[PDB]
Amino acid sequence: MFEARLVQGSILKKVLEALKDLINEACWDISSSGVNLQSMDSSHVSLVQLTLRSEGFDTYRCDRNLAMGVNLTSMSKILKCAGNEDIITLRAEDNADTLALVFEAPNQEKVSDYEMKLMDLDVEQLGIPEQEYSCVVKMPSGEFARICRDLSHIGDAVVISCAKDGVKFSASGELGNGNIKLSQTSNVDKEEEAVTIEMNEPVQLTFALRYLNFFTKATPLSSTVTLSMSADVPLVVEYKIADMGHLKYYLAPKIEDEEGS
Amino acid sequence: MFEARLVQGSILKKVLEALKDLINEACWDISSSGVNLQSMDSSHVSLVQLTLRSEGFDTYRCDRNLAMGVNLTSMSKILKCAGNEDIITLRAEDNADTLALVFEAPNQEKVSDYEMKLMDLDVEQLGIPEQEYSCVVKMPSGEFARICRDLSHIGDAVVISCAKDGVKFSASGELGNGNIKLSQTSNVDKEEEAVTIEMNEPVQLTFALRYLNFFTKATPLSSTVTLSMSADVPLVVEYKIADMGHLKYYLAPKIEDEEGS
Amino acid sequence: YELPWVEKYRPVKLNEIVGNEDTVSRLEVFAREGNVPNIIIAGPPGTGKTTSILCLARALLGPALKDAMLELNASNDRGIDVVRNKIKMFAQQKVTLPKGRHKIIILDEADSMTDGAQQALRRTMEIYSKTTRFALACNASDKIIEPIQSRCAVLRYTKLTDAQILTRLMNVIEKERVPYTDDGLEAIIFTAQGDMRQALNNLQSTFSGFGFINSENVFKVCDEPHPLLVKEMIQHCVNANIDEAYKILAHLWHLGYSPEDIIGNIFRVCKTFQMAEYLKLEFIKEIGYTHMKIAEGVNSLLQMAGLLARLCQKTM
Amino acid sequence: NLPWVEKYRPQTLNDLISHQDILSTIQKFINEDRLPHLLLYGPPGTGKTSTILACAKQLYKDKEFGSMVLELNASDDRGIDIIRGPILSFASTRTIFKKGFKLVILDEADAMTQDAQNALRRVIEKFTENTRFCLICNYLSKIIPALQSRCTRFRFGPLTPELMVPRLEHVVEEEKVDISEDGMKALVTLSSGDMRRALNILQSTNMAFGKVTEETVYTCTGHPLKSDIANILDWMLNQDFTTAYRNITELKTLKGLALHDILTEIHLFVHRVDFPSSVRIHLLTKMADIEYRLSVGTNEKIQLSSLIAAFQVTRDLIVAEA
Ligand SMILES: Nc1ncnc2c1ncn2[C@@H]1O[C@H](COP(=O)(O)OP(=O)(O)OP(O)(O)=S)[C@@H](O)[C@H]1O
Ligand SMILES: Nc1ncnc2c1ncn2[C@@H]1O[C@H](COP(=O)(O)OP(=O)(O)OP(O)(O)=S)[C@@H](O)[C@H]1O
Ligand SMILES: [Mg+2]
Ligand SMILES: [Mg+2]
């Protein structure tokens, strides 16, 4: 018997509006550590890794480990009928197939029990490497979301660079060239508006713009986002939820072969 | 000679967007009691009654009864022309083929005389039986609109169940069942959230979704909504708009399935 | 608000189906084997192609029928978008089912779809074969492409035989306690023209109209050309007579019947006439020639009189 | 002012005649609220639309006739967009009026294709308790047997002249025109057992000339005269080939006749002429062949010569048998 009590529906709402245009079907692993979502997209390029800890929920109870799989657009439309100040009760049992979302409304008088039908897809678990990378940059999430929306217009795929100085965004689009470079943003009053460089080895890699745009729809979950780049292991975009868990997006590069000349 | 003056212009500018997509024309009937407007939808499912009494107007001049037929397509764009707190007047002659709507421009500088033609439409009054309703619910209006918007994401035909416990709005679609039940909201400070049940015998009626959305298009007219239903009587949605009169929506249920055992 | 007898007395188990013999035994074996393949059911309309797969699905799934059974008719939209969305959506749901149980997606009237719909249905049947088993009810199996029927079993339904319709009609008569005569049973067979739902509808129509079953009451509510007069016309055409046959034809023409109705009853009587075999075949060839004239657009009384003269000229 | 059919259209179950068993069964079904989907089929102008409009005005009042009755006719094309269009949306809805079924009058239902009739079969079987269809058609055989197997059919036959003449006497007593016996015989023969063409021909004879006799009807309509076809058959049976061909082609270019009308009137004539059976078979086979040869669109003089040819072989055989 799996029962999770989300304290606020806003974080679930932002998680689902982040994952709405990326994943065909979402798989949840349920254990005493909490809930896990390690999955691929509809095109087998990106990876989603959502971890929700046990202490973040109001009441979290689980007897046996559960591997459920649900349609995602159906769950987006189910969660669309919900407020932002209501506790959310995810219910499932041992030997059935219905996922129940029970929450309050903004009237705070009426219960709302939305049933859903799961899927029977057996998905091989891909092992996350959990290795070190070549560059780690801490940056506020609104900056990354607005620069993804700003950089989607110039081109179709973008090359990003990180070095000892700071982070760099480049786009060789049909309109022309778009190049930004930001470093040493820590000299403000706010603690969110800060860019921190951790590692040494500079990296330049190109990625599709649409996957970055679908990654940046987790904007108000975390005030600060973490970007990890490496030459071999994929690009990591990590949103740290404050008292619930974390959410990582992994993005594979694209081919940019040099000219023969 | 018909002359009417409203106290605030926003009455028409909230009551005519509810008839923008629901009904195709307007049949104004003039009398010493005031103005009324009974229109059946083109699909003969939805019925709109609008009754504005003479005491709510600033001034009201009428001599004999008049039947008037107008087109709502241009009127639904002429509602965008007027302001929100201006003073509107309706003027109609005896033998003329055009009616005048005279008000002030939103600049508060310019007299606006908009002239609209009359469609000589041959319509007849149906005649409401006005039977004793088997269940009466007093509810908020924005709550009803957001619950119709909530069940617009599940199925195309909601189910209203009304028992002595209260009202249960349930939508079943290809996604999954979602039910919302209200009961006993008299313990609130404001008097507009008193979701009250006024009759004993339970009913269970299945209604269309787009029609209830077209009905809930009229939220800011009033604060509370009176929903009347019975075993075979259509759904009655009553709005006590300000002090000048009221509005009524009549909706036939959907055809039940052959679920005999 | 009484239900019509077409859907009121539809059978609920495979033991009550009288149409086929080998195919209903194959379905009875499939209902206990639990390894049901994807099937395509072919036959004439109204022979029971969707009250058999329905009984198989109800005997297979049982209490989990409402969650693990999808009937898709041609009543809804028959575009490519609905088949892409709804069938894949239903196949992707999970149902807690036993070992030898699968979801069933019945596709009634699967012949009206295009080549793209069936060439995508190839992959939908191939990929989800563990979870769900398809059952396409087709009116004509030649319109089904070869790669669809290579990977799925083909089941054939014949037109109801008059003995089987007799057994079903006498079962319905004994169930509803209807008084009957043998001439009324022959008349309801003749107006039934081999179709079961047509037979049940005509029987319930004449029972609601007049009650007691007799051969005169059947043709008051149907009003075909009477088979006694049409059989007399064929008998006069076979006995070297043209004047009496045209007298019967003019009697059936001043009752306002179309040429198509009279020539259809002419062929239906000449199917079950009693004469020589070669005379039957020459008569059927002449009737088919005249029906080609009539359906071409020559629908005068002179064409029927010429048909009568040619039938009288074949028999010396 | 107005045509007589639009003036004197029947509005009562007793004002429609010769359908008394059908009207009795319809009244029996409609008093007990057991009326099924109806399929009224028959010749044109025998009382198909007016019967169901009388039944609709019996069921519904004048105010709710325009709301719970939808009429589709020959102005609407009957394909597959209509059956998924207005008639499905009409049948699949309830009404704020008294708790009764709807009604859809679909004129000329024999012009629907097999796919259209199967889609209509789906719509009919899906919604029964709230909608009762009425398909009216000329040919029963042009619709599928499934559609015949779900809706109750009724054969609206032609009106016998014995029962047809009291209504003609009523309309000649109400409207004072000159009436003779041969004019009434021409009316009940040329009208071919349907009241619509009889009233139209009677009104056209009244408006054109003023009196109704046999020759006035024949001149206003253009039907081939009996003595005309008698002269044609006499020329074919007792004249030379060139003489008969010249006489009949002058009569065709004078009287305005056509060879199809000559063929059907001669076909009606040769079953009065007491031929032997063998030459009757020969004449009928030859004339049916000439009818088909005219149907496929050939020259007309050669088919006329073939008709004269069949009758000349006939006259040789008749004289040789004498
Ligand atoms: N062998 C049979 N035994 C009993 N009832 C039968 C039999 N065959 C047909 N019926 C009856 O006839 C009707 C079956 O109609 P359907 O199966 O829906 O038509 P169909 O043959 O499947 O062709 P489709 O689905 O339109 S392509 C029901 O009313 C059955 O009760
Ligand atoms: N039984 C009848 N008694 C009296 N008048 C009749 C009768 N049947 C037909 N008529 C007259 O003939 C007209 C034609 O009748 P309708 O029913 O409208 O035609 P119809 O039978 O529907 O055939 P269509 O529409 O040409 S296919 C009516 O308006 C009457 O004037
Ligand atoms: Mg079927
Ligand atoms: Mg008509």
Side-chain angles (χ1 to χ4, degrees):
Chain A
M1 181 180 182
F2 159 65
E3 289 244 0
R5 295 284 303 270
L6 271 303
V7 280
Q8 52 173 180
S10 60
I11 46 176
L12 177 63
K13 174 184 299 300
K14 292 171 230 308
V15 156
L16 241 178
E17 80 196 357
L19 298 183
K20 199 185 71 173
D21 287 312
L22 186 64
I23 310 297
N24 55 328
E25 51 92 10
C27 50
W28 270 276
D29 307 327
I30 292 99
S31 177
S32 182
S33 63
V35 113
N36 187 274
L37 182 128
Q38 199 160 38
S39 186
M40 301 301 186
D41 60 316
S42 305
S43 302
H44 303 269
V45 185
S46 303
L47 172 130
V48 285
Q49 205 282 145
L50 176 66
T51 309
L52 304 187
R53 277 77 172 249
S54 62
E55 76 276 356
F57 307 118
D58 249 353
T59 299
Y60 174 72
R61 52 148 308 179
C62 183
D63 301 337
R64 55 111 185 180
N65 173 263
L66 173 58
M68 75 180 193
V70 81
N71 203 337
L72 176 129
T73 72
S74 303
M75 195 185 42
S76 323
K77 291 212 298 298
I78 283 272
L79 166 133
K80 212 71 62 184
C81 346
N84 295 37
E85 64 268 25
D86 44 357
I87 41 102
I88 288 190
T89 312
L90 287 167
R91 301 168 170 255
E93 69 169 51
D94 308 328
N95 296 329
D97 36 7
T98 57
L99 163 70
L101 293 92
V102 177
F103 38 74
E104 301 294 323
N107 193 26
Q108 295 294 143
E109 181 55 60
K110 48 208 218 175
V111 302
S112 309
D113 300 22
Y114 288 84
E115 302 289 335
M116 292 198 57
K117 311 178 180 182
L118 302 167
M119 292 177 72
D120 209 359
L121 300 193
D122 42 339
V123 179
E124 313 172 13
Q125 293 177 335
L126 184 121
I128 171 180
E130 306 176 14
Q131 254 73 68
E132 304 174 2
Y133 299 97
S134 301
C135 267
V136 168
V137 296
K138 173 67 65 180
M139 181 226 299
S141 57
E143 259 92 325
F144 186 43
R146 293 182 183 174
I147 200 50
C148 183
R149 282 197 302 264
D150 193 76
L151 220 54
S152 302
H153 300 134
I154 163 75
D156 201 289
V158 285
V159 201
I160 57 176
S161 178
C162 197
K164 297 286 197 302
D165 189 21
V167 86
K168 185 180 180 60
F169 286 79
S170 57
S172 298
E174 63 273 2
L175 284 83
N177 295 96
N179 271 258
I180 92 159
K181 173 83 180 181
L182 60 140
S183 324
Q184 55 188 3
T185 299
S186 61
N187 295 20
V188 298
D189 300 327
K190 290 185 176 180
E191 296 182 350
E192 305 180 9
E193 316 265 332
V195 167
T196 308
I197 311 297
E198 267 93 325
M199 311 242 193
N200 45 12
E201 200 269 338
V203 175
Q204 300 89 357
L205 274 182
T206 164
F207 303 97
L209 267 163
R210 45 142 300 173
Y211 293 98
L212 292 171
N213 275 260
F214 295 154
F215 288 170
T216 48
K217 297 197 296 171
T219 313
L221 280 171
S222 177
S223 59
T224 56
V225 80
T226 310
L227 305 181
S228 302
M229 293 74 59
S230 185
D232 294 324
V233 175
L235 161 65
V236 178
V237 185
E238 157 80 303
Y239 297 89
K240 297 180 61 61
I241 323 182
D243 294 80
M244 175 60 60
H246 59 86
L247 176 48
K248 292 192 174 185
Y249 298 107
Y250 282 30
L251 186 48
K254 84 160 299 294
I255 283 293
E256 275 288 330
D257 291 333
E258 306 177 8
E259 51 173 346
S261 299
Chain B
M1 189 62 178
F2 164 69
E3 194 269 346
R5 178 179 294 265
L6 271 311
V7 175
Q8 288 190 180
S10 292
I11 300 151
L12 262 300
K13 314 305 146 180
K14 295 175 221 302
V15 88
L16 241 50
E17 286 93 325
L19 316 176
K20 148 79 180 298
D21 297 321
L22 183 55
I23 48 175
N24 42 320
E25 37 79 28
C27 181
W28 306 81
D29 185 24
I30 321 290
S31 62
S32 179
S33 61
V35 288
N36 63 276
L37 198 146
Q38 169 167 289
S39 302
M40 190 181 285
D41 207 334
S42 63
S43 312
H44 294 354
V45 187
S46 162
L47 184 56
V48 187
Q49 274 82 7
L50 169 97
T51 310
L52 316 177
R53 311 299 175 89
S54 303
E55 59 266 11
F57 289 90
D58 196 11
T59 173
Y60 191 69
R61 300 169 62 253
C62 68
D63 42 0
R64 293 182 183 174
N65 58 88
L66 298 176
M68 164 60 201
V70 63
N71 162 262
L72 294 178
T73 302
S74 284
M75 211 175 184
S76 302
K77 284 177 291 179
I78 294 169
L79 53 80
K80 301 184 179 184
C81 301
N84 55 338
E85 303 175 0
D86 49 349
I87 301 106
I88 70 174
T89 48
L90 275 77
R91 316 197 81 260
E93 315 295 322
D94 197 10
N95 310 318
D97 207 3
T98 327
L99 71 94
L101 308 111
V102 173
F103 48 86
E104 197 69 30
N107 207 8
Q108 203 37 245
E109 81 154 3
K110 174 147 59 184
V111 42
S112 181
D113 299 3
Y114 284 147
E115 300 278 352
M116 199 168 302
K117 63 160 286 295
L118 188 147
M119 170 56 63
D120 205 332
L121 185 59
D122 203 316
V123 283
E124 51 191 337
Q125 306 300 101
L126 164 65
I128 308 111
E130 294 121 5
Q131 210 259 330
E132 177 88 356
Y133 309 106
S134 299
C135 259
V136 176
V137 186
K138 190 160 300 301
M139 230 163 54
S141 190
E143 184 264 351
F144 192 30
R146 73 171 182 84
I147 214 57
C148 286
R149 185 164 42 101
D150 277 6
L151 300 190
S152 300
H153 288 62
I154 299 307
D156 299 339
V158 314
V159 174
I160 323 283
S161 176
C162 209
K164 206 55 187 176
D165 307 67
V167 175
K168 167 177 161 294
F169 315 134
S170 178
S172 295
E174 319 286 339
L175 280 64
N177 311 274
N179 58 90
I180 294 109
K181 42 198 65 178
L182 289 95
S183 186
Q184 293 177 335
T185 299
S186 64
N187 301 24
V188 284
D189 297 359
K190 316 168 186 176
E191 308 176 12
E192 56 178 341
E193 296 94 15
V195 185
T196 64
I197 290 286
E198 315 285 340
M199 212 59 65
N200 31 5
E201 67 272 61
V203 289
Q204 279 172 331
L205 307 110
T206 310
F207 297 103
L209 175 78
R210 185 179 38 87
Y211 279 140
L212 268 174
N213 283 254
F214 286 156
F215 284 178
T216 53
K217 295 305 183 306
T219 59
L221 271 65
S222 59
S223 307
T224 31
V225 166
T226 300
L227 292 111
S228 301
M229 50 182 49
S230 175
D232 293 70
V233 182
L235 161 93
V236 192
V237 199
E238 302 210 18
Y239 290 75
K240 281 291 298 180
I241 165 180
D243 297 317
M244 63 216 54
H246 86 302
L247 183 138
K248 283 190 301 185
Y249 282 136
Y250 285 78
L251 199 55
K254 276 201 172 187
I255 306 108
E256 312 300 318
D257 299 356
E258 302 90 13
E259 41 89 38
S261 184
Chain C
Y1 299 145
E2 297 282 344
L3 287 178
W5 289 9
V6 187
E7 311 294 326
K8 185 178 179 179
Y9 294 148
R10 197 159 70 172
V12 299
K13 40 202 298 294
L14 275 312
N15 317 81
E16 306 173 358
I17 291 184
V18 85
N20 288 32
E21 313 304 315
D22 46 356
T23 312
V24 70
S25 64
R26 193 189 320 272
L27 292 183
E28 191 72 29
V29 168
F30 280 170
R32 66 168 63 97
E33 180 73 21
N35 199 20
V36 276
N38 320 276
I39 55 177
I40 48 171
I41 290 182
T47 191
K49 307 191 304 303
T50 43
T51 176
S52 308
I53 183 57
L54 165 65
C55 285
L56 176 66
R58 286 186 284 102
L60 196 132
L61 282 322
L65 179 82
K66 319 297 171 185
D67 314 326
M69 176 178 73
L70 180 66
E71 292 230 13
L72 178 62
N73 314 273
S75 61
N76 320 122
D77 191 61
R78 286 294 286 173
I80 187 176
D81 169 72
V82 47
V83 190
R84 281 197 311 254
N85 285 336
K86 192 178 186 63
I87 306 300
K88 178 179 56 59
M89 266 293 318
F90 174 71
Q92 281 180 2
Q93 313 304 89
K94 68 173 307 298
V95 186
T96 302
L97 288 179
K99 164 71 182 178
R101 297 301 111 91
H102 310 263
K103 300 192 297 296
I104 294 184
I105 312 179
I106 308 177
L107 272 80
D108 197 9
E109 193 31 69
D111 289 329
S112 63
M113 61 171 56
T114 62
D115 296 338
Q118 51 192 166
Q119 81 169 290
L121 202 64
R122 291 191 292 181
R123 196 215 34 86
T124 68
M125 286 169 57
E126 189 168 344
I127 283 200
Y128 300 110
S129 182
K130 175 58 199 173
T131 52
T132 177
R133 305 302 182 103
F134 282 74
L136 319 178
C138 57
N139 208 21
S141 59
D142 43 309
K143 305 167 63 179
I144 280 184
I145 56 176
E146 190 262 357
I148 275 289
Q149 56 186 357
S150 65
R151 296 185 177 94
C152 81
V154 193
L155 278 58
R156 194 76 56 175
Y157 271 72
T158 69
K159 193 53 173 179
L160 295 327
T161 313
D162 57 85
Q164 313 161 331
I165 301 181
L166 257 183
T167 309
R168 172 133 282 260
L169 278 178
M170 73 93 50
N171 207 330
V172 170
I173 278 168
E174 206 272 343
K175 183 193 305 301
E176 283 274 357
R177 210 156 283 101
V178 182
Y180 74 104
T181 49
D182 214 320
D183 300 359
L185 260 62
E186 185 180 358
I188 206 83
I189 282 171
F190 195 81
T191 50
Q193 43 77 53
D195 206 356
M196 179 52 69
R197 53 173 307 115
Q198 184 67 78
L200 247 56
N201 174 259
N202 290 21
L203 188 64
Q204 68 101 352
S205 73
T206 187
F207 190 78
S208 63
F210 293 144
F212 173 66
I213 293 300
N214 35 345
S215 58
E216 50 266 9
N217 284 336
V218 186
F219 296 102
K220 291 188 187 64
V221 305
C222 304
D223 210 332
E224 283 192 338
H226 201 283
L228 177 61
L229 291 174
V230 177
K231 187 180 58 183
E232 279 172 9
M233 183 187 310
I234 286 296
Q235 178 59 60
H236 285 167
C237 273
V238 63
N239 226 334
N241 203 328
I242 181 62
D243 189 22
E244 306 286 335
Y246 186 78
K247 143 192 167 185
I248 299 174
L249 173 65
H251 173 43
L252 293 180
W253 182 263
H254 294 344
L255 296 184
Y257 290 103
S258 60
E260 291 87 353
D261 208 338
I262 301 182
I263 200 173
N265 201 283
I266 271 282
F267 173 67
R268 217 149 47 84
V269 166
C270 203
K271 260 180 163 174
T272 167
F273 203 60
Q274 180 54 254
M275 49 173 162
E277 321 95 306
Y278 81 107
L279 221 47
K280 271 219 172 187
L281 298 161
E282 292 292 328
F283 271 27
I284 293 320
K285 201 161 61 179
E286 288 295 323
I287 288 157
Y289 274 139
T290 309
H291 208 137
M292 277 183 271
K293 308 283 182 55
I294 289 179
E296 190 167 330
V298 208
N299 43 79
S300 59
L301 164 65
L302 184 54
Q303 290 288 334
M304 295 295 303
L307 159 68
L308 262 57
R310 283 180 253 168
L311 292 186
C312 195
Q313 206 168 25
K314 287 306 178 69
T315 73
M316 304 179 183
Chain D
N1 185 29
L2 281 185
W4 289 13
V5 276
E6 276 73 43
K7 285 187 176 185
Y8 303 142
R9 182 177 298 262
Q11 309 283 350
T12 309
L13 195 132
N14 305 332
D15 294 1
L16 289 130
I17 42 185
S18 182
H19 309 329
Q20 292 294 327
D21 196 10
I22 296 180
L23 291 169
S24 169
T25 322
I26 283 177
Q27 183 73 17
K28 171 190 174 182
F29 289 157
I30 210 51
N31 289 143
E32 304 180 9
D33 202 357
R34 300 173 75 259
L35 188 75
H37 305 248
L38 289 184
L39 177 74
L40 313 167
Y41 71 105
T46 185
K48 297 190 293 292
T49 310
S50 55
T51 288
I52 204 62
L53 286 188
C55 189
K57 295 184 186 304
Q58 171 185 2
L59 264 183
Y60 314 130
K61 319 295 164 300
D62 182 72
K63 50 180 194 303
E64 64 174 349
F65 167 69
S67 310
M68 296 176 64
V69 168
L70 174 62
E71 205 277 336
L72 299 172
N73 63 91
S75 59
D76 302 76
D77 47 323
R78 287 167 298 276
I80 210 61
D81 61 326
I82 163 181
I83 316 294
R84 288 193 292 270
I87 184 175
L88 161 72
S89 59
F90 193 86
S92 58
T93 43
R94 283 276 191 88
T95 58
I96 333 179
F97 304 68
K98 313 180 190 303
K99 304 302 145 60
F101 46 85
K102 286 191 172 184
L103 198 70
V104 178
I105 314 296
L106 187 171
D107 213 348
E108 303 107 355
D110 56 84
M112 278 181 299
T113 67
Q114 177 157 8
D115 189 21
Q117 283 151 7
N118 279 277
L120 191 73
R121 130 183 181 272
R122 303 293 187 181
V123 174
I124 282 171
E125 206 55 52
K126 183 69 180 306
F127 317 102
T128 311
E129 307 295 323
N130 80 284
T131 308
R132 257 64 186 263
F133 285 71
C134 175
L135 317 172
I136 49 179
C137 50
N138 301 340
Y139 326 103
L140 176 63
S141 58
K142 275 201 174 301
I143 76 177
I144 68 175
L147 206 60
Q148 304 174 30
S149 81
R150 52 197 70 255
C151 67
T152 305
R153 52 186 174 183
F154 281 118
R155 167 69 197 181
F156 269 151
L159 298 115
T160 319
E162 171 191 7
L163 205 137
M164 191 177 190
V165 290
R167 189 76 213 275
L168 309 179
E169 284 164 2
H170 185 274
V171 85
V172 88
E173 176 257 2
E174 186 182 13
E175 291 280 343
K176 300 104 178 60
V177 309
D178 309 338
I179 161 184
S180 62
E181 287 283 339
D182 58 337
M184 295 305 114
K185 172 62 65 179
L187 252 302
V188 305
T189 296
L190 181 49
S191 67
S192 73
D194 47 81
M195 291 282 196
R196 158 74 61 86
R197 216 53 60 211
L199 293 183
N200 239 40
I201 281 303
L202 210 53
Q203 181 182 328
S204 185
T205 317
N206 174 41
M207 283 196 298
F209 306 134
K211 60 173 182 298
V212 180
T213 46
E214 203 173 9
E215 83 289 334
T216 48
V217 168
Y218 278 148
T219 45
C220 192
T221 325
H223 197 253
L225 283 82
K226 303 181 179 182
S227 64
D228 219 13
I229 309 299
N231 291 338
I232 295 302
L233 197 130
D234 265 331
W235 292 340
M236 286 172 178
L237 266 189
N238 51 263
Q239 291 294 329
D240 303 332
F241 205 101
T242 189
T243 296
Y245 174 71
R246 198 116 51 86
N247 287 8
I248 297 164
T249 195
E250 288 309 307
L251 195 133
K252 280 191 60 181
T253 193
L254 171 70
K255 215 64 193 63
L257 286 188
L259 195 48
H260 318 83
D261 307 286
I262 288 179
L263 257 184
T264 178
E265 273 301 314
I266 279 182
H267 163 53
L268 293 182
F269 210 125
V270 293
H271 292 279
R272 316 178 212 164
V273 199
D274 186 60
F275 288 110
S277 64
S278 56
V279 72
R280 180 77 63 84
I281 289 166
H282 166 236
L283 272 177
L284 282 175
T285 41
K286 284 298 182 58
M287 283 185 295
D289 292 332
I290 295 155
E291 177 102 6
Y292 185 48
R293 289 195 285 259
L294 289 168
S295 167
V296 306
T298 71
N299 204 338
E300 280 75 20
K301 344 179 178 182
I302 321 182
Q303 310 295 332
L304 175 62
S305 303
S306 68
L307 185 51
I308 302 166
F311 277 104
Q312 283 288 325
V313 179
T314 287
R315 78 165 196 153
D316 289 305
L317 259 301
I318 285 312
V319 172
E321 283 153 357

